[PDB]
Amino acid sequence: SMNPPPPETSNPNKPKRQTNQLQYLLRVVLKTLWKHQFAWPFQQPVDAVKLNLPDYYKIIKTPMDMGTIKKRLENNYYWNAQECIQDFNTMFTNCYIYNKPGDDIVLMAEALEKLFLQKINELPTEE
Ligand SMILES: Cc1sc2c(c1C)C(c1ccc(Cl)cc1)=N[C@@H](CC(=O)NCCCCNC(=O)COc1cccc3c1C(=O)N([C@H]1CCC(=O)NC1=O)C3=O)c1nnc(C)n1-2
């Protein structure tokens, strides 16, 4: 079995910015979620080989995880905050699609998403 390559984190042709909103997404949002007791499954791509999930990447065709998001934020991959918010949303939705309601990992993702949304409510106005 094999894992796919990870999502892109470097592309010199993609235009970049570091807006106050993107700074907040790293400093506050990512860093707060990262330290949560339920962060660990989401801190790196799903290793479908290690976890014996041969169907994972047959079902999940837009993989995303907080390790990738952290790299994208630290390496300024984004132009805007919405791109990053979309990555978080993709991560949560993937978990809900692959797993069943009430599964432990779904409860973990839901707790992180609740926290994420709280933090997004204080996203600063773009200066
Ligand atoms: C590092 C990561 S990343 C990650 C995860 C981890 C550990 C986790 C995860 C999970 C829990 C927590 Cl608290 C935290 C993280 N989750 C995975 C999903 C997962 O592992 N999904 C696995 C789901 C497996 C369930 N499926 C079965 O057990 C299928 O088994 C069946 C189903 C039907 C019939 C039979 C059998 C079976 O084994 N047998 C055997 C029995 C023995 C026998 O004699 N004969 C048989 O045929 C059946 O008859 C996941 N999804 N998103 C993320 C993120 N993750």
Curated annotation (Swiss-Prot):
List residues traversing the bilayer.
none
**Where is the Bromo domain positioned along the sequence?**
17-123
Q: How is it modified after translation?
A: Phosphorylation by CK2 disrupt the intramolecular binding between the bromo domain 2 and the NPS region and promotes binding between the NPS and the BID regions, leading to activate the protein and promote binding to acetylated histones. In absence of phosphorylation, BRD4 does not localize to p53/TP53 target gene promoters, phosphorylation promoting recruitment to p53/TP53 target promoters.
Q: What are the coiled-coil residue ranges?
A: none
The entry's free-text remark on domains says: The NET domain mediates interaction with a number of chromatin proteins involved in transcription regulation (NSD3, JMJD6, CHD4, GLTSCR1 and ATAD5). The C-terminal (CTD) region mediates interaction and recruitment of CDK9 and CCNT1 subunits of the P-TEFb complex. It is also required for maintenance of higher-order chromatin structure.
Q: What does this protein do?
A: Chromatin reader protein that recognizes and binds acetylated histones and plays a key role in transmission of epigenetic memory across cell divisions and transcription regulation. Remains associated with acetylated chromatin throughout the entire cell cycle and provides epigenetic memory for postmitotic G1 gene transcription by preserving acetylated chromatin status and maintaining high-order chromatin structure. During interphase, plays a key role in regulating the transcription of signal-inducible genes by associating with the P-TEFb complex and recruiting it to promoters.
- Disease linked to the protein: Cornelia de Lange syndrome 6: A form of Cornelia de Lange syndrome, a clinically heterogeneous developmental disorder associated with malformations affecting multiple systems. It is characterized by facial dysmorphisms, abnormal hands and feet, growth delay, cognitive retardation, hirsutism, gastroesophageal dysfunction and cardiac, ophthalmologic and genitourinary anomalies. CDLS6 inheritance is autosomal dominant.
What's the protein called, per UniProt?
A: Bromodomain-containing protein 4
Q: Which organism is it from?
A: Homo sapiens (Human)
